[PDB]
Homo-oligomer: A and B are copies of this chain.
Amino acid sequence: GPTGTGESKCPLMVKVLDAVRGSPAINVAMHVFRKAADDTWEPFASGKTSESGELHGLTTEEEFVEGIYKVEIDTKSYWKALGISPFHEHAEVVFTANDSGPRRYTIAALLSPYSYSTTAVVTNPKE
């Protein structure tokens, strides 16, 4: 069931890989925003990837209602810390969530200094 600001079925998970080192991307900062009624972007959640390159517990089933969400990935900080001057300021993922009921979302991203790819895996909830 729901929860309220932590980690229901884990309705939203993010995974990041580094294509240069062949490893999980660790300590990568991320901010999530939701489009508010007035049409602006409101802060929703933030965190950093673990040593496994994942970010879990951003929200709960109860709190993750229908709307348009934006996941901002701080790729620039990550490359600079390694001595590389990257092309993008950050990577962005914008999507509509739960318009036909609750779903679980896994966002995956693969990073290179001059290129990034993002994909999503969507599942119909629990079994």
Residues of A bordering B, CB below 8 Å: 17-24, 68, 87-90, 92-96, 108, 110, 112-123
Contact = CB atoms under 8 A, between A and B. Distances in A.
24 contacts: A17-B121, A18-B114, A19-B114, A19-B115, A20-B20, A20-B113, A20-B114, A21-B113, A21-B114, A22-B121, A23-B123, A24-B121, A87-B95, A87-B120, A87-B122, A88-B93, A88-B120, A92-B94, A112-B115, A114-B120, A115-B117, A115-B119, A117-B117, A117-B118
Nearest to A124: B23
A118 B119 contact: no
The 10 closest A-B pairs by CB, nearest first: A22-B114, A117-B117, A115-B119, A19-B112, A19-B115, A89-B94, A92-B92, A87-B120, A112-B112, A22-B122
